[PDB]
Amino acid sequence: GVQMLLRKLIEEHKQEFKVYQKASDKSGFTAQVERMLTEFKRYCLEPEDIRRMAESGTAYRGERVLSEKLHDLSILYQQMEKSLADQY
Amino acid sequence: TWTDDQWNAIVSTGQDILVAAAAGSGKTAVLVERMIRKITAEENPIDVDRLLVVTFTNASAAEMKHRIAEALEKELVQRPGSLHIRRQLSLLNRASISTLHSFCLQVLKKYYYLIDLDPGFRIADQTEGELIGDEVLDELFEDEYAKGEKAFFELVDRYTTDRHDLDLQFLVKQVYEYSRSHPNPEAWLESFVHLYDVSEKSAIEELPFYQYVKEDIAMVLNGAKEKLLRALELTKAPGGPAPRADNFLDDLAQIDELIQHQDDFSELYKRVPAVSFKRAKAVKGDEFDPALLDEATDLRNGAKKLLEKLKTDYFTRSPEQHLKSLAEMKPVIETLVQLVISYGKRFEAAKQEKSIIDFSDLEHYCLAILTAENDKGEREPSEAARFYQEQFHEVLVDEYQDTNLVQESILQLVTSGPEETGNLFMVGDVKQSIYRFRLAEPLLFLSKYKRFTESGEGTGRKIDLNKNFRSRADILDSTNFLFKQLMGGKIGEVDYDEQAELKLGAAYPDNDETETELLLIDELETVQFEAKAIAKEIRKLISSPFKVYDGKKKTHRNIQYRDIVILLRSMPWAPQIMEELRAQGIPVYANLTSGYFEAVEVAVALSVLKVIDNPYQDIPLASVLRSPIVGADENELSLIRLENKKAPYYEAMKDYLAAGDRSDELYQKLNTFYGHLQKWRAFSKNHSVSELIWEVYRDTKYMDYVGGMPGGKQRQANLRVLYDRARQYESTAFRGLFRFLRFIERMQERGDDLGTARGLSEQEDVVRLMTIHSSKGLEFPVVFVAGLGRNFNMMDLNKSYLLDKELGFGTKYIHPQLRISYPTLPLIAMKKKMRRELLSEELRVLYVALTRAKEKLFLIGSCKDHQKQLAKWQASASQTDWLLPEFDRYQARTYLDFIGPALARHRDLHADISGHPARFAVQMIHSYDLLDERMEEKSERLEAIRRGEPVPGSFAFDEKAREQLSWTYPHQEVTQIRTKQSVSEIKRYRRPAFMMKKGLTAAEKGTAMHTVMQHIPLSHVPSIEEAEQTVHRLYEKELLTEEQKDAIDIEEIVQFFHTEIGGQLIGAKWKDREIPFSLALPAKEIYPDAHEADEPLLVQGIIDCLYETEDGLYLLAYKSDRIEGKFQHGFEGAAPILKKRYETQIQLYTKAVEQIAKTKVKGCALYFFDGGHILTL
Amino acid sequence: KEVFADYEIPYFIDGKASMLNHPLIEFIRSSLDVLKGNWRYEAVFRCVKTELLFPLNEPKAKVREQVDQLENYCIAYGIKGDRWTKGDRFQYRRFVSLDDDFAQTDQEIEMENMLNDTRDWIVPPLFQLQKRMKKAKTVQEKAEALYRYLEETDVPLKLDQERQRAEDDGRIIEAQQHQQAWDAVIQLLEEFVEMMGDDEISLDLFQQMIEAGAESLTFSLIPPALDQVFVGNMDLSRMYGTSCTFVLGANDGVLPARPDENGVLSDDDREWLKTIGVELSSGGRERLLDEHFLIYMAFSSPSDRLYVSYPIADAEGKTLLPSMIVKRLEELFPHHKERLLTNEPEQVSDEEQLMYVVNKSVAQSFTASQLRLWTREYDISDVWWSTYNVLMSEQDRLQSKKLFSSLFFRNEVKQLERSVSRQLYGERIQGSVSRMETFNACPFSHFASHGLHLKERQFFKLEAPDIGQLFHSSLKLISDRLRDEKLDWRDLTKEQCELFSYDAVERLAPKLQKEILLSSNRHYYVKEKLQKIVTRVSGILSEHAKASGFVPIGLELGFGGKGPLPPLTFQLKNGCTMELVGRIDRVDKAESSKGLLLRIVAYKSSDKGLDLAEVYYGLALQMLTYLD
DNA sequence: TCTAATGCGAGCATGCTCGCATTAGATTTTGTTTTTTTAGCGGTT
Ligand SMILES: Nc1ncnc2c1ncn2[C@@H]1O[C@H](COP(=O)(O)OP(=O)(O)NP(=O)(O)O)[C@@H](O)[C@H]1O
Ligand SMILES: [Mg+2]
């Protein structure tokens, strides 16, 4: 159910991505994102934390890439919690 | 014990390193120890996951992993305190030691997002991917025909036959495939037109392809010149003919006249068809020599044929005509290029949709990921490439002489920097490259050998290893003797000079035995004679034990079958050989890639599957019937037909079942089979093909049956991998009987095949029949090389078109309307060039084959006539040079055409050549000599088996076997009994949400009631409004959904508290609610036949209420049952019935509290919301 | 599952099973595939074969047989796409001949009726689904379209029937899983409309998501029994009071396990994320180390006995290596002997071979192979002579005997009895030269062919014989037209050759192989190719006629049966008469000094002529028969 | 599909090569490559 929600959100905000645009097309991708965000929740990391980590990144060899990823993930994450807030 | 050069290779750093050396130089060993040394270093330590080792085979990778782990352990024994080495032993499972394909797979998996690839992609089965390709080729062709463009028809007409267009299909496939061996396939495809961009004004000699024409001409004219010179020499001999000299000298002059014009194609067009040899001057007298007389004429006629061949090749049309034809073909090529490009784009789109990739997509997608910017072949490294550059300190490549351009690109992007100061270590041997059929480029190696210097200053360093540590001197000398005469320049692509010759370095105690043997063999198959000879000599090796020396251990061991290895160039002959060796009694193992569906067991088992799929297939049905599965004989079969002639065979079978009587045997066979058939058909609908196949096996016992007939081991293996193959295909894309069968049929129709299953594992003591290609990098004590008299496969030359890595697409000039075709110049050039390349590689194949051996080498080849071939061998061997005549080597069609003449100048069949320290044992066998029944001992047991009666008497294990076969598990009955049980169970399809009336589910109401009943304060009896304030305390805290809240009778809830039992509850010393419990109950109570040793069942439940008054402990339950609505006596009709409805449950609950708390409960009450009734139990 | 089934060992697997084999799941998937790919053969018949389209309360066996013959029909006539939903009835002919045009027999009518009747219950639910689906724009109305599709085909009722049928057979678990399949599907749809119900999406995205959902579906865990072997894993499984433990597949690369790093966040991503103070799940690096603890817990789990096994080879025979753990164990227990696990009992001790006889089937299976080995002059264990003997003592030794009759198995055929032969082939044998040739090639082939009349499954595909028939018939039509216009082959012009040839192929095309030359554009071009061939052949015959003194008398002449010439006949010992009837391609007459001359001409599609060797062995008899 | 054998006649040095044409035979592939993590039900309907 969350995966489907993700796919929806992905279609809606794919234009805002910095690195996962090419992959947002793929079905495997939404599964990956779902697993990632679930891990985030299991390790007590709210959307704002993820945003913050991204911002920290923008300014380690793969820091640029990682920050891009975390940015896209944070858009999907935050949007998810928005969509789920008072109903699910 | 490392050689100086070896150590140089093991320690050298700072720059790209190429290690070039012949066979058995320790290149692979050097590589391993370089790795070890790098990791296990006191001075500077690096982790194993900081190196990239790319091997050729997965086995080689695993082998490296172990040969490493052991060294790590020795280092650990010597240094226990080491934290590092300890960690390295662990990192070995995280190590990048594999094939390049595996590395590509890791790249795609991690950086999928950089390209258009699904992270959950999978690599397609060979046939699967090919089928996808076949489909899109069909779609594409239909679209082109639909469009009906004139260009398309102009192409089809030229490259298809007169009734179908399959050849064009194959053509597209082949061209696409070839193009995929370049880093930029499209660009290579678009370079096609340039070969055809000529005019009548163009200068032939300046055109690229003409290079290969030039050489050919230069080779044949000289080839004739020499051929005449010999004839001239034959004039000087005493018995030789003197008067014919003036003939030869004339011909020579004429041929020499052509040689002065080799460079000018036009002049050659003028002179070559104008050359005529004056009539042979007859020499009459007995002073001459009839043999020599008739031999010189052969040489002269040889010159004639060479010239005529040159003429028909190049000079039957003017250069202007040739160029006009070539230019004419240009538009057709342009259409072909565009067609192949559409195919690819479509093929990729197809594979993308199913989220799969080629085996070929691995390389190309990896390369895509590694590049960011590509400028005319200049690839700038992407982020992924930088990552892999930093992660890997060094990149190690073995078998580099078989690297291809795509792989090389990937290596160039993962390695760190320019050649001069890079981290690319590579070992290999040009002489051993055997994968040009797979478009590998050994020239990649060669160019790097030429650019590199021993000094390695400003460039990369090359390192030579001269010593051979693998084999005995007999092998090395035999090899070196053969290849100084064969491999050179045009044929071999490499000089077999002193630096490249094998040099003894291994210590081996002597043997008279190790002589290299050549066995020439003169209504029986030739392969059978060869196999007979092989087996014979193998038995000779076994009868008196050959001694096998372990160079490292320095300890001998008796000869084992696992020491003998038979190498073949091609495996068509392998089956017959295996059969013959088994006839002689020798154990054989050969890894096969074909013949699976020819196995009768496979055919029959498949037939069962098809019949289960659709019984209305006469032949698969009849097949299953006549098979041992049913066992109907010919009379019984024809009997089935008789019931119904016009109908399908299945119908006839049905009818015989309908009319037949239970007394007959045939009816019983057919009735059993039909019952089985129906069982299986039902079975296929909710089970996989695999489960079906295993079930068919256990119902028919067909695997059991075939295991007891000849070849049984193999047969059971076949049926086994039928199961396993099914499991793989199910797992992947063909789940279910129908899809699986379809896949198998589609596969077979293509011309694809699977290999027969391996009955025995490799590690067992058997003689291995393998291809020479499988042999590389390996060493074996004794080695056979058979099929030497067999022709080279050069079918590629014969087609109307040819593909070339350098030149592209060569074709015949083809005019569909005029009905004429003839080779264009670049086609002939590409043909000649291809023959050269092919021959050179076959030589390298032979080199690998011979260098495999350690101590013994057998060469078996067959021939029509010994003396004729010996004569021809001599004819090619009269030269004083080591290297045989270039043209003669160019004319070779079989391996014997190489080995023969090179073996002719040897003593065993010029002192430098004749006296070479190579020993050859020549056997001139004829078929009849190879050609060379046992005691008839009856067996009581065999016939007793036939009868079905037992074997006479009293074996040791009779008693124990009796005991086991009649054994039954004591606790059998309780093996199926579920442990956890429901209180409801002990007594023992819904629409979606968006299709229903919203809300107010009947059970929901009851559950709601329950929740309030358990969260209501029990301090005192509440008011009717009080309970409601409780309810929006509950709604707010979301304990009950507002939907549930809306549906609640507040009066019904309050009413219970007015009643005397409820009054007791509020006025209770102690009270508790929603009390869950688990209770153990001996299985016997719920199930008869159970036992005390047999575990108790667990029964869980939730008790609504429990309260303790001064008198005792009481149980309370609530039911949202419907009472007042439908009972004749109302509650009093309900009361006996309700008591029944919950009696079992209550008895279980009371048993729980009674057992666990060990306190008897005085009374139990059932409160019903409907009517407020309370039933006492 | 299968092995422990055969060795009668009760087990509990710590894992859920897939629904991907269930008829409902495949029904939905294949149905959507029917829509997406426009009624391709494979999709449609996947769908049909799940049996959920079957007419309610009709006998599934009979329905199946009907579908089967429909399927053969579709394959033979190349039915796909629009042809399914066209109004036209599927037309059926048992055999179509180019030369002679025939009226539909009564059997053919009966068949045609059956085929179309089967079609008429297949198409509507699928057709209606397709219609509803094109019209549905949002996730919810597509989900509703699909669910309605399930409702209208009475899927819940059919599945419930299945539940009961299974329960009656005692298959409680297999019966329980049907309702699981239904509830799973309904939940899938429910969620889909819950998250994206109002969003408009394409059919491709819908099918994609539905498929992604169904791939993840799993049945519930089978509840544990009172006495089961526990089969599970090493990462998540928990046990208690275990007495014996078998650790399996202790292979290199397997144990310890190579972790797969691949997620959104790399190992180096995670490792760096740690240094900046954010903690996530263990990256692969750590897990690879925790493998030691896993193996430690696995090894110290039993109280009494521990087994550590590893296979050396693949299912395909690929070599598997023993892990480091095996060596490590060899170090800690250097005097322990390693035991061999093989399906070749000969390779172990008699005491171990005795372990093999666990029940009657296992025993039968191993005994038969041991018997084979024995016949190959090898000493099989006493265990197998004991076993064989008990098997022969037991109640139904006839079965074991049948199994062991493999020891003397040969591929033998029993000669046909006089009465059977008489009935099959008849008292009078009507034949063709080709039948005789078939027999001379191989008697059994002739038996399967002209005896049993076994037909191979027909395919919508242009083979060589069809093309041959086309050529023959074409030349016939041309010749006839030539005589009707008082024209002779000599007087033909190039223009006339082209015109006649094209016309002839045009005429014959709709009759050739189920109208396959009209089937596609590619086949249109095939037709053109054939036209070009016939054209050139026409011209060639015209040139040959201008240089030959031989004049064609009869073309496609018939001897025997209907044809004017009488059948050549033979008499037999049996008292049976064998008459052979056939058709000569061409016969030419000439006038000469020696007399009237006759020659026979045959139109063939191969360059090869007549081999006397093949004549001697009875492989090539047609020509000399025609001449005779 | 290319190499080899067979047949016949013209030009040359009555018997021999050579040209040419043609057919007929037989003779015939090699190959490798993965894993997908991530905590059993549910008493009461
Ligand atoms: N310095 C040495 N001392 C002793 N034995 C050696 C030495 N170098 C190599 N060998 C042995 O010689 C054999 C050949 O070594 P190998 O590593 O296969 O070389 P290679 O160049 O890779 N052979 P190849 O791949 O076919 O070209 C192996 O069995 C080694 O153990
Ligand atoms: Mg090597």
Residue B1019 sits in a domain whose CATH number is 3.90.320.10
CA distance A49 to A71: 11
Q: Which two tokens stand for residue B850?
A: 């011979």
CA distances from A37 to A8, A69, A74, B522, B962 (A): 15, 12, 9, 76, 62
CA distance B1034 to B1011: 9
Assess whether B342 and B368 both reside in one domain: no
Cβ distance A26 to B390 less than 8 Å, yes or no, reads no
Residue nearest to atom 23 of ligand 1 (CA): B24
Q: Which residues pair with B755 in a beta bridge?
A: B595
Strand D at less than 7 A from CB of B282: yes
B61 CA distance to ligand 2 middle (Å):
12
CA angle, corner A30, sides to A29 and A32, nearest 5? Answer: 65
* Cis amide linkage into residue C256, ω under 30° from 0: yes
CA distances from C39 to B41, B731, C32, C391 (A): 67, 25, 10, 55
Residue nearest to atom 6 of ligand 1 (CA): B469
At which of B757, B781, B809 does a domain end?
Answer: B757
Write the CB contacts of A61 (distance below 8 Å, at least 6 apart in sequence): B386, B387, B390, C268
Helices B473-483 & B825-851 angle (0-180, nearest 10): 160
* Torsion from C-alpha of B579, B581, B582, B586, nearest 10 degrees: -160
Contact in structure between B713 and B588 (CB atoms under 8 Å): no
Write the CB contacts of C376 (distance below 8 Å, at least 6 apart in sequence): none
Residue C6 near chain B (CB below 8 Å) = yes
* Element holding B254 (H helix, E strand): helix B245-259
Task: Tell me how crowded residue B308 is: count the other CB atoms within 10 A of its CB.
Answer: 13
Asked whether residue B941 is assigned to any structural domain, the reply reads no
Instruction: Considering only CA atoms, give the Rg of chain A.
Output: 13
Q: Which of B212, B207, B224, B204 is nearest to B267 (CA)?
A: B204
B221 CA distance to ligand 2 middle (Å):
42
* Element holding B1077 (H helix, E strand): strand B1070-1081
Write the CATH number for B194.
Answer: 1.10.274.50
Nearest CA distance, A29 vs chain B (angstrom): 6
Considering only CB atoms, A23 lies closest to which of B119, B355, B386, namely: B119
Residue C449 near chain B (CB below 8 Å) = no
Asked whether residue B323 is assigned to any structural domain, the reply reads yes
Cβ distance C529 to B163 less than 8 Å, yes or no, reads yes
* Torsion from C-alpha of B226, B231, B235, B238, nearest 10 degrees: 110
Mutate to test the interface with B, among C149, C525, C534 (most CBs of B within 10 A): C525
Residue located via tokens 């297999």: C174
Q: What is residue B610's DSSP assignment?
A: H
Pairing of strands B356-357, B1174-1176: unpaired
Assess whether B496 and B578 both reside in one domain: yes
Contact in structure between B41 and B51 (CB atoms under 8 Å): no
CA distance B869 to B787: 16
Asked whether residue B1152 is assigned to any structural domain, the reply reads yes
Residue located via tokens 């059932």: B1166
CA distance B398 to B408: 13
Considering only CB atoms, A32 lies closest to which of B117, B119, B386, namely: B119
Chain D: nucleotides below 7 Å from protein CB are 1-2, 12-13, 16-19, 27-45
Write the CB contacts of B1087 (distance below 8 Å, at least 6 apart in sequence): B973, B974, B977
The chains found to touch C (3+ Cβ pairs under 8 angstroms) are A, B
At which of B289, B317, B345 does a domain end?
Answer: B317
Assess whether B489 and B351 both reside in one domain: no
Assess whether B1014 and B1135 both reside in one domain: yes
Assess whether B372 and B425 both reside in one domain: yes
Assess whether B250 and B333 both reside in one domain: no
> Distance from CA of residue C305 to its chain's centroid?
47
CA distances from C572 to C329, C579, C580 (A): 81, 11, 14
Write the CATH number for B37.
Answer: 3.40.50.300
Phi, psi of A24 (to 5 degrees): -55, -20
Assess whether B114 and B135 both reside in one domain: no
Cβ distance C21 to B686 less than 8 Å, yes or no, reads yes
Cβ distance A69 to C265 less than 8 Å, yes or no, reads yes
Contact in structure between B1117 and B1104 (CB atoms under 8 Å): yes
Strand D at less than 7 A from CB of B106: no
Chain breaks in chain B (C to N over 2.5 A) after: 522, 909, 932, 988
Instruction: Considering only CA atoms, give the Rg of chain C.
Output: 36
Nearest CA distance, C196 vs chain A (angstrom): 7
Residue located via tokens 């036992």: B1091
**DSSP letters for B108-170:** HHHHGGGTT--TT-EEPPHHHHHHHHHHHHHHHHHHHHHHT-HHHHHHHHHHS-SS--HHHHH
CA angle, corner B628, sides to B625 and B629, nearest 5? Answer: 65
Q: Which of B43, B6, B46 is nearest to B27 (CA)?
A: B6
Task: Tell me how crowded residue C408 is: count the other CB atoms within 10 A of its CB.
Answer: 13
Asked whether residue B1073 is assigned to any structural domain, the reply reads yes
Q: Which residues pair with B785 in a beta bridge?
A: B567, B859
Stretch 25-54 of chain A: residues touching chain C, C-beta under 8 Å: 27, 31-33, 35-36, 39, 42-43, 45, 49, 53
Assess whether B601 and B636 both reside in one domain: yes
Residue located via tokens 């969003």: C199
CA distance B305 to C281: 79
Q: What is residue B181's DSSP assignment?
A: T
Contact in structure between B1034 and B1045 (CB atoms under 8 Å): yes
What domain count does chain B have? 6
CA distance B67 to B48: 14
Contacts of A43 in chain C (CB under 8 A): 279-281
Long-range CB pairs of B763-766, under 8 A, 24+ apart, other chains included: B763/C312, B763/C319, B764/B562, B764/B587, B764/B589, B765/B560, B765/B561, B765/B562, B765/B587, B766/B561, B766/B562, B766/B587, B766/B588, B766/B589
Strand D at less than 7 A from CB of B1005: no
Contact in structure between B529 and B731 (CB atoms under 8 Å): no
Instruction: Look up residue A32 and give its amino acid.
Output: Q
Return the residue of A nearest to B119 by Cα: A28
Q: Which residues pair with B18 in a beta bridge?
A: B426, B462
- Per-residue burial over B1065-1101, b if 16 or more Cβ lie within 10 Å, else e, is beebeebebeeebebebebeeeeeebeeebbbbebeb
Assess whether B1113 and B1152 both reside in one domain: yes
At which of B934, B966, B984 does a domain end?
Answer: B934
Strand D at less than 7 A from CB of A35: yes
Cβ distance C147 to B995 less than 8 Å, yes or no, reads yes
CA distance C554 to C565: 11
CA distances from B1144 to B986, B1134, B1138, C462 (A): 8, 17, 11, 74
CA distance B133 to B131: 5
What residue spans of C249-381 are helical by DSSP H?
267-275, 284-299, 324-332, 350-353, 360-375
Task: Tell me how crowded residue B594 is: count the other CB atoms within 10 A of its CB.
Answer: 15
CA distance C183 to C194: 16
Assess whether B618 and B716 both reside in one domain: yes
Contact in structure between C245 and C302 (CB atoms under 8 Å): yes
Stretch 220-249 of chain C: residues touching chain B, C-beta under 8 Å: 223-228
The closest-lying atom of ligand 1 relative to the alpha carbon of residue B29 is 17
Q: Domain containing B812: what range? A: 124-205+318-357+797-824
Pairing of strands B588-589, B767-771: parallel
Q: Which two tokens stand for residue B105?
A: 């797979």
Nearest CA distance, C211 vs chain B (angstrom): 12
Indicate the SS3 state at residue B933.
coil
Asked whether residue B995 is assigned to any structural domain, the reply reads yes
Strand D at less than 7 A from CB of B576: no
* Element holding B98 (H helix, E strand): strand B96-99
CA distance B554 to B416: 43
| Residue C452: burial class (beta carbons within 10 Å; 0-12, 13-18, 19+) | buried
Counting Cα atoms < 13 Å in the Cβ hemisphere of B366 gives 25
Counting Cα atoms < 13 Å in the Cβ hemisphere of B611 gives 29
Return the residue of A nearest to C272 by Cα: A60
Asked whether residue B990 is assigned to any structural domain, the reply reads yes
Instruction: Look up residue C351 and give its amino acid.
Output: E
Contact in structure between C310 and C250 (CB atoms under 8 Å): yes
Binding-site annotation, residues of C for [4Fe-4S] cluster: 442
Asked whether residue B118 is assigned to any structural domain, the reply reads yes
Helix/strand/coil (H/E/C) assignment for every residue in B22-40: CCCCCHHHHHHHHHHHHHC
Q: In which region does residue B777 sit, left (phi positive, over 0), alpha (psi from -120 to 50) or beta (all else)?
A: left
Return the residue of B nearest to A21 by Cα: B113
The ligand placed nearest to the CA atom of residue B468 is 1
The closest-lying atom of ligand 1 relative to the alpha carbon of residue B2 is 1
Cβ distance C196 to A4 less than 8 Å, yes or no, reads yes
Assess whether B729 and B781 both reside in one domain: no
Pairing of strands C11-13, B1174-1176: unpaired
CA distance B869 to B650: 61
CA distance B866 to B874: 12
Way it was determined: X-ray
Return the residue of A nearest to C270 by Cα: A66
Chain breaks in chain A (C to N over 2.5 A) after: 59
**DSSP letters for B371-395:** EEEEETTEEEE-HHHHHHHHH-SEE
| Residue B44: burial class (beta carbons within 10 Å; 0-12, 13-18, 19+) | exposed
Contact in structure between C32 and C210 (CB atoms under 8 Å): yes
Assess whether B138 and B150 both reside in one domain: yes
Q: Which two tokens stand for residue C62?
A: 């009979």
Cited resolution, angstroms: 3.0
Asked whether residue B46 is assigned to any structural domain, the reply reads yes
Cβ distance A36 to C272 less than 8 Å, yes or no, reads no
CA distance B504 to B258: 47
Phi, psi of B458 (to 5 degrees): 80, -15
CA angle, corner B38, sides to B36 and B41, nearest 5? Answer: 95
Write the CB contacts of B496 (distance below 8 Å, at least 6 apart in sequence): B431, B480, B483, B484, B486, B487, B488
Phi, psi of C339 (to 5 degrees): -95, 150
Q: Which of B852, B854, B918, B850 is nearest to B547 (CA)?
A: B854
The ligand placed nearest to the CA atom of residue B854 is 1
B54 CA distance to ligand 2 middle (Å):
13
Stretch 28-67 of chain B: residues touching chain C, C-beta under 8 Å: 59, 62, 65-66
Strand order in the sheet with C551-559: C551-559, C582-591, C596-601
Strand D at less than 7 A from CB of B474: no
CA distance B89 to B61: 16
B854 CA distance to ligand 1 middle (Å):
11
CA distances from B520 to B579, B700, B920, C75 (A): 21, 50, 12, 55
Cβ pairs A/B, distance under 8 A? 35
